[PDB]
């Protein structure tokens, strides 16, 4: 019997700073035990300082990104070139996803950008549209490997102040773009080591008020 879904592997990662936000993702595309492409980007600039990635089944992922990109275009036409805020984009994506509630897009979606106060924002979606704003989110094949590391290093979970008898927690603070990129790179090298579907290359998209910058790094190709 025909199975309309497939697993294209890969993994993605979003972190939000004070005045910036990053959305990273490896460039490896796979089916079963074969590599399809060592460089197939899945993190996209969608306009209005919104970056998006829909990891999982690539065909559904591409379809969604394509449709959201188109949603941004028509938002400009219908509302006098108004900038689509990250919170508005998120809600719009929920309706795109839930629109196919009974034949879902098999993807974990993450978008990143700046909120209307200029602060860094990351939103994450399940396959049928439930969404939540967070400081931190990993998605995809190696999400289970990366996410607990992020809890520890971004949100300082289970870390207490030395000598305070485990009474005072390590205080929360925003990370610099330099420190965030260090965590992204270490997360992906670690994921590459222990997950077979992760490797080849790492592409990061950084979002500030100035625009959308890109950075690329090699990953192990085994």
């Amino acid at each position: 019997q025909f199975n309309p879904y497939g697993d294209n592997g890969g993994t993605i990662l979003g972190i939000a700073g004070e005045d910036f936000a990053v959305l990273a993702g490896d460039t490896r595309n796979i089916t079963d035990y074969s590599i399809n492409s060592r460089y197939e980007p899945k993190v996209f600039d969608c306009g209005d300082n919104i970056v998006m990635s829909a990891n999982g089944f690539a065909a559904d992922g591409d379809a969604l990104v394509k449709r959201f990109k188109n949603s941004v275009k028509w938002y400009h036409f219908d509302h006098n070139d108004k900038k689509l805020s990250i919170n508005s984009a998120a809600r719009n994506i929920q309706h795109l996803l839930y629109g196919k509630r009974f034949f879902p897009y098999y993807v974990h979606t993450i978008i990143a950008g700046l909120d209307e106060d200029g602060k860094g924002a990351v939103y994450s979606f399940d396959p049928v549209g439930s969404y939540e704003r967070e400081q931190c989110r990993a998605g995809g094949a190696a999400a289970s490997l990366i996410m607990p590391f992020l809890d520890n290093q971004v949100n300082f979970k289970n870390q207490y102040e030395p000598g305070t008898n485990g009474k005072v927690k390590k205080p929360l603070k925003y990370l610099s773009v330099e420190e965030v990129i260090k965590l992204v790179r270490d997360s992906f090298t670690s994921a590459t080591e222990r997950h077979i579907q992760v490797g080849d290359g790492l592409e990061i998209l950084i979002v500030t008020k100035d625009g959308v910058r890109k950075e690329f790094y090699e990953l192990k190709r085994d």
Partner: protein
């Protein structure tokens, strides 16, 4: 007879032009836009003294940030308001934000020409759509049955429109306060109204960023009427 969507030799749609004549027979409605807010006011015009004038609903809420006044065949406005309200709430559902006043007006005006041989005839009612948004601030729109809408600093529609519009031309300036605008609507309404203006046969409303769209009480308007008369006698 003849087609509903027929052009005249001058290049106008007969039915649209005839619906405009129906709007001239309607009761007067005035709107004035300021930097402190937008004021909407209407002539109620009760056909008989036994009619309870508070039930005459010619000023209407579309959303918290958008209000609406009407003139002409007011029964036709019900489905237009229903559409506007749905459009406003629906956009909030899809985009987690308030909808632009212009975008709302455009959505209403898309219904206008959806008639022919869709509904059987154009709307016989004009609307003054007032509101506020973060981008273009305080706005006043005049939505016709032709499908056209103009933004206005001030605008009068109805039977006393051409006389009131000429008065608004002289009186309006870019530094009008909200209180000044309120009185100005009452002043111009009292001029063009047949019966003598009071709190029962005329109604005021406004929309401000802070408090949103509010229809004034008959007690509040009565004081603004009394304040208006005193100021005219004072010089």
């Amino acid at each position: 007879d003849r087609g509903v969507s027929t052009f005249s030799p001058e290049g106008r749609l007969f039915q649209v032009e005839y619906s405009l004549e129906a709007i001239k027979l309607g009761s007067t409605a005035i709107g004035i836009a300021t930097k402190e807010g937008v004021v909407l006011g209407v002539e109620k015009r009760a056909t008989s003294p036994l009619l309870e004038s508070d039930s005459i609903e010619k000023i209407v809420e579309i959303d918290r940030h958008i209000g609406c006044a009407m003139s002409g065949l007011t029964a036709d406005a019900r489905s237009m308001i229903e559409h506007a309200r749905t459009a406003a709430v629906t956009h909030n559902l899809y985009y987690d934000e308030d909808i632009n006043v212009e975008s709302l007006t455009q959505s209403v005006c898309d219904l206008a020409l959806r008639f022919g041989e869709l509904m059987s005839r154009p709307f016989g009612v004009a609307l003054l759509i007032a509101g506020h948004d973060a981008d273009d601030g305080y706005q006043l729109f005049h939505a016709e049955p032709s499908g056209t809408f103009y933004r206005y600093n001030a605008k009068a529609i109805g039977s006393g429109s051409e006389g009131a519009q000429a008065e608004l031309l002289n009186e309006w300036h870019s530094s009008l306060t909200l209180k000044e605008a309120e009185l100005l609507v009452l002043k111009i309404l009292k001029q063009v109204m047949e019966e003598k203006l009071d709190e029962n046969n005329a109604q005021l409303s406004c929309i401000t960023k802070q408090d949103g769209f509010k229809i004034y009480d008959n007690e509040k308007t009565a004081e603004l009427i009394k304040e208006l008369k005193e100021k005219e006698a004072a010089e």
